[PDB]
């Protein structure tokens, strides 16, 4: 069911014409809600580690933390396969006050070099994510994080840090790619800025490092869009085809409801098309 890149404009058009099979039906065919077990996530002892009760971590794909407390192994995060590479990303919720330390522990544990943040901290008066990075230097658990560079651009900001587990000698470099123009449950007016942002991550992420951590507020909608676009550009570049429906289907098998609205699903298509034209 793959679509030739050469045929993508025609496909998207046909899919936007209300007259035959289109995006509403296609989106409605994606599996909605829970499709696999999440027994650990729904443990009483882990309720306060989950931001949204409906978007919690499937057992098969969940990122397990070293146990410190038998329930210390839980974070609301899942490995997500990329095009080339299994466990290429971790999709997770935006940290909560309670989970900031767990978040940095996962980063250390997993050898992650990149964080992709596709939310603002507050949106229309609602907290979406707690600030989990320092203005200067801060210790989260025993993870010491120091800001070394800020690069502001029009629709996003890249912040670079050193990261060190206290009492050990390794000092790592990490980048936080923070996209600032994408509203929760919404989509950007244009794909262009987001595509530049994607291009930066692909350019700068060290491929020898651990998974790229991707998060929004719940870790489904905008997180899923970023992952879908990123993956499909790899597929397009390599095969001259994209299969966005099975991509998002596969995304949902690994973590519930990634790409959370029809408008987002359509936006993923528009963004991939633009990248392919360019």
Residue numbers in the entry: 889 to 956, 959 to 1168
Authors' account:
Protein tyrosine phosphatases (PTPs) play a critical role in regulating cellular functions by selectively dephosphorylating their substrates. The ∼280 residue PTP catalytic domain consists of an α/β structure, and biochemical and structural studies have led to a detailed understanding of the catalytic mechanism (Barford et al., 1994; Zhang, 2002). Key features of the domain include the PTP signature motif, the mobile Trp-Pro-Asp “WPD” loop that in the closed conformation positions the conserved and catalytically important aspartate residue, and the phosphotyrosine recognition loop. Here we report the crystal structures of 22 PTP domains, including two tandem-domain RPTP structures and a detailed structural comparison of this protein family.
In the fourth category, both the gateway and secondary pocket are blocked and the inaccessible binding cavity harbors an aromatic residue or a proline in position of Arg24. The second-site loop assumes a twisted conformation in these phosphatases. This architecture is present in the subgroups NT5 (PTPH1, MEG1), NT6 (PTPD1, PTPD2), R1 (CD45), R2B (RPTPμ, RPTPκ, RPTPρ), and R4 (RPTPα, RPTPɛ). In contrast R1 group members (e.g., CD45) and R2B group had a more than two orders of magnitude lower enzymatic activity, suggesting that enhancement of activity by tight association with substrates in signaling complexes may be important for efficient signaling.
